[PDB]
From a paper:
MarE C280S crystals were obtained by crystallization in the presence of 50 mM sodium cyanide and 10 mM β-Me-l-Trp. The structure determined at 1.89-Å resolution forms a dimer of dimers, consistent with the homo-tetrameric oligomeric state of MarE in the solution state, without requiring further crystallographic symmetry operations. The cyanide nitrogen, in turn, interacts with the main-chain nitrogen of Gly127, both of which are part of the DATG loop originating from the lid helix α5 and extending through the active site. Residues from the neighboring subunit, including Tyr24∗, Val27∗, and Leu28∗, along with Phe51 and Leu121, create a deep hydrophobic pocket that accommodates the indole ring of β-Me-l-Trp.
The amino acid sequence of MarE shares significant similarity with tryptophan 2,3-dioxygenase (TDO), a histidine-ligated heme-dependent enzyme that catalyzes the activation and insertion of molecular oxygen by a histidine-ligated heme into the indole ring of l-tryptophan (l-Trp), producing N-formylkynurenine (NFK). TDO and its closely related homolog, indoleamine 2,3-dioxygenase (IDO), catalyze stepwise O-atom transfers, completing dioxygenation through two sequential monooxygenation reactions. However, MarE diverges functionally by catalyzing only a single monooxygenation reaction on a tryptophan metabolite, terminating the oxidation process before full dioxygenation. To elucidate its enzyme-substrate interaction mode, we present the first X-ray crystal structures of MarE in complex with its prime substrate, (2S,3S)-β-methyl-l-tryptophan and cyanide at 1.89 Å resolution as well as a truncated yet catalytically active version in complex with the substrate at 2.45 Å resolution. These structures establish MarE as a member of the heme-dependent aromatic oxygenase (HDAO) superfamily and reveal its evolutionary link to indoleamine 2,3-dioxygenase (IDO) and tryptophan 2,3-dioxygenase (TDO).
Author numbering:
A (entry chain B): 2 to 215, 228 to 273
B (entry chain A): 1 to 216, 227 to 265
C (entry chain D): 1 to 215, 227 to 269
D (entry chain C): 2 to 216, 228 to 272
């Protein structure tokens, strides 16, 4: 009934949509397609690709936030098994954001980006991303819910870390092994998000410069050094602290090795 | 000031704040896009949002596939082969996003959740009405046509274009022919990726509605149709002629 | 002191040097693995090495899949549900590596190269003799049996375990039934990934030997039509999971003639 | 035939191989499987998974090396289209190494790693990886071959970057656009290898510690994890990232003019 592409003479090349189908109705799809910059307003043929990769990312992150909320509810009621599924789903959605920014790295021409950017508004930065800002916000109540669940069960993090190793002989329970799977899914999620940050950094080096082996400024006026420093901020620093803790407590090698 | 996507959640740290009027949000029409999500007050199942978001991600990727394919037609019609290559490769990357979106359902959507949601869904609520799918199928013919006519204007045979992908092939080469070969190769990758989508979507359906063939009446879609019709449409390519040319090469070159 | 895979190479910067006796190399048995590559003096096509390596990578992932599935049997037999989960998830990740490796051929192996190489390959050189695939098919029943037995020892129904994946489900739950539910979900992900390998391998064959069904048939190096490949391609590792999926569709769906 | 696990007494669980089929003959598969540490010698059940992920990686890297040599040959003879394919193939092979290291991040138990690492030889390090040492060594001749091909065509790197943009109106030839496609493929390859380095770093943070947000552990060679992080930012083709930054300075019209 409608077309995103009205002035296209060739009718086989029209993007026909908004047919009022029940599939369309269920998804609020016409509403979501209405957010695309209208073809009559695009300033560069690469503009649509630019916008779509961000919208895909923001949809993935709002869903991450939704499932992390659910995981807080599960942990607060000691429903460990149900918490695991929320974290695994979140990791998968995170991996879509990684794919989406790597689309820019692999296919966004830097010269198109620079042309487009010379005309963008002044403080147009992903520091204002709602997916990113809310993922940072919610990470703290998420860690707290896990930490408190481990406490109620009378375990340490060193315990649940150790029980991932089949050869570890300490006594276990159903609850301790469930909290272990939770920790492992949480670590995979945080690893994925850290991966998003590194791939977005590699993208920036290919579009604006500043590859550290070799500074440019964001539209906010900020050196890329600031982006690069924030790129190593984790969702759950406590988990990475517990990893290093395991190295110090269980490694029996420190300050004894040398080159051969 | 910010708005909340979940404004009846008491704990502010659990609030999804957005619509802050930043230039990032303005340039992307992000607030409008987030407005497509079913309101939290109206969800009937906690997995409904996940359901919706995997579709919306897929449809954004497919409308972008369409946009880039139109560009590929424009290039091919003017013999801009290099520039056409990039459009096909970009489409393949977007298609791979759709594959991971539906595999998100395979890996994480509980069949039991799906069946409960499906019992309340409307009748003939089907992806046969997907704009992404229908318009992709629509545009695939003009796309094959633009590639075929560029090959014809070059006076090349498709068999020759296939052959010179092999470094060991000794026949005549030109910049034009090797360019059209890179276009060919990029086109086959795109179609193969789309055939991957169709199969992963089918594997999903097997895990959610049943009917895995290894088991040798079938379940039915929300429009009353057997899953065997889905399985048959699952092997239809975008560019049949490329798969015929591969078959022709085996017969001409196979000893 | 050292070896080279291309020793005659003029430019020393193009030499692939290995076997330097490092501890890294010693721990991994790397020299022996590199020793399996077709020698450069013996290659008959510049794409031969790509062909070989994609298979060797696949076979390494599948023997690891086998090792971890054996561990999953041992866990399930002792009711170590959580530990079994990890084995299945790991096998799934290893399976996804095999998907990547065959899609490398789809995306980058020229059909014309394949045909030239295929014309010179021995008779009945076929992946029906893949040790990875044969031992995977061997172990698939022992693996399903271990899961089924554990479910029975717990006095649960497969339909119950499926229902427990849904947060909205009101039925009785226990720590053991939800654990067995995470195991079911992990073995389904593995089987869907192996079904994914089969479909991508099929798509690759269509682009290299022909026979895309949307369009008598080509033959493998053993003489068999591609019709038998397509049929074997829908065979799952754990048919009883897919059976349980359809069982639930009839059991829970309320619109089968609506 | 023969079994990889002969002391397994249930024959349905034997991994049978060395059947002398032509499939195995062509592939040298029996020799390659013989590199696996024998089951009777493994000291931890996670040891095989550890070894196999390295072996997959080194197979992928030796194939990257082989195809980059071919790319040098193509470039020295101005066969641009042919070189593009070798770089694209290398990129796919690099992506296999990324998935292999991420298999350790997602599934290798830190506690098993530490147990295993406490018994490993001293200075057993991937600094002695042949895939890694040879890829670093060959990257210089690869870049020189591209650079010389660009010079011979009388082009600048700015020109081939600009020609990736459909809106750029400078004069083009078949050669210049072909050399652009080559550049774009080498950038994807180098970005993929930079991705491997970052995912390998994230893995190391989860196994030995040292995640930089928390602020050190030492390698089996006694070297601080800070040196690994420093080398993590070294590209194959630094000149490509230098030309990206060059484009920012030459073509961006915003520097030192924006602010929050
Ligand atoms: C899918 C596309 C993108 C997404 C989702 C995205 C998201 C983000 C996010 C969340 C941040 C804040 C991250 C942090 O500080 O840790 C950010 C910052 C930044 N992004 Fe992106 N980004 C995208 C594409 C781009 C592109 C194409 C460029 C440039 C070519 C770019 C350049 C930057 C810069 C320079 C910053 C730092 C802002 C500052 O410090 O003022 N990004 N982006
Ligand atoms: C991201 C999620 C999904 C997308 C993008 C999607 C898209 C599509 C498309 C494009 C078709 C038509 C394809 C063809 O006919 O060749 C289709 C059909 C179909 N899909 Fe989906 N789908 C999705 C999820 C699902 C789910 C979760 C189910 C069931 C649990 C499902 C079941 C079906 C069925 C049964 C058909 C056949 C329709 C008929 O023949 O009446 N799909 N879908
Ligand atoms: C990474 C590369 C490959 C791997 C790991 C692999 C593995 C396998 C396996 C396990 C089978 C038995 C599965 C079944 O028949 O259901 C098989 C069969 C088959 N493969 Fe492959 N394969 C690869 C590449 C190829 C290539 C490049 C071709 C031809 C272009 C090919 C053509 C066939 C055919 C025709 C069959 C049918 C069985 C027969 O040969 O009679 N495969 N492959
Ligand atoms: C697939 C598995 C792995 C591969 C292919 C691999 C490869 C490499 C390579 C190529 C290097 C040298 C790169 C550089 O330093 O710039 C390296 C260094 C290093 N790797 Fe790995 N690695 C793997 C797994 C691991 C694991 C499991 C650990 C520890 C838990 C580890 C810890 C380190 C450390 C500490 C270094 C720095 C060595 C030193 O500076 O002495 N790696 N690895
Ligand atoms: C290029 C620009 C930008 C990058 N992605 C954006 C999305 C919407 C609006 C602006 C942007 C980026 N933030 C920069 O500062 O360079
Ligand atoms: C599950 C159902 C459906 C699947 N995806 C949808 C999206 C919007 C509306 C309905 C659906 C699918 N079409 C079916 O026939 O089963
Ligand atoms: C091409 C050929 C073959 C495919 N993969 C192989 C590995 C080793 C030896 C031979 C092969 C394949 N089995 C065929 O029958 O066509
Ligand atoms: C754990 C260890 C190691 C990591 N990967 C290896 C492969 C072979 C031999 C040793 C290793 C690593 N090099 C370290 O220094 O911690
Ligand atoms: C992003 N900016
Ligand atoms: C989809 N239906
Ligand atoms: C495979 N053969
Ligand atoms: C790594 N060694």
């Amino acid at each position: 009934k409608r077309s995103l592409n009205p002035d296209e003479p060739n009718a086989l090349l029209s993007y026909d949509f908004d047919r009022g189908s029940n599939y369309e109705n269920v998804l609020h799809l016409t509403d979501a397609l209405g957010a695309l910059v209208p073809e009559s307003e695009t300033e560069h043929p690469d503009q649509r690709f630019f916008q779509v990769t961000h919208l895909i990312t923001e949809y993935a992150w709002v869903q991450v936030h939704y499932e992390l909320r659910r995981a807080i509810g599960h942990l607060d009621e000691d429903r460990y098994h149900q918490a695991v599924r929320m974290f695994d789903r979140a990791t998968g959605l995170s991996e879509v954001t990684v794919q989406a920014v790597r689309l820019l790295t692999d296919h966004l021409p830097q010269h198109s980006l620079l042309m487009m950017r010379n005309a963008l508004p002044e403080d147009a930065t992903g520091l204002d991303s709602p997916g990113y800002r809310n993922l940072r916000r919610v990470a703290r109540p998420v860690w707290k819910a896990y930490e408190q669940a481990v406490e109620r069960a009378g375990l340490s993090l060193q315990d649940v870390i150790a029980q991932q190793d089949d050869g570890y002989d300490g006594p276990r329970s159903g609850g301790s092994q469930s909290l272990a799977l939770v920790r492992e899914a949480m670590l995979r999620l945080d690893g994925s998000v850290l991966g998003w940050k590194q791939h977005h950094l590699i993208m920036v080096w290919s579009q604006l410069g500043g590859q550290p082996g070799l500074l440019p400024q964001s539209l906010g006026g900020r050196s890329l050094a600031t982006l690069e420093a924030r790129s190593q901020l984790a969702l759950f620093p406590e988990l990475w602290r517990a990893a290093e803790d395991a190295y110090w407590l269980l490694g029996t090698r420190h300050d004894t090795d040398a080159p051969v």
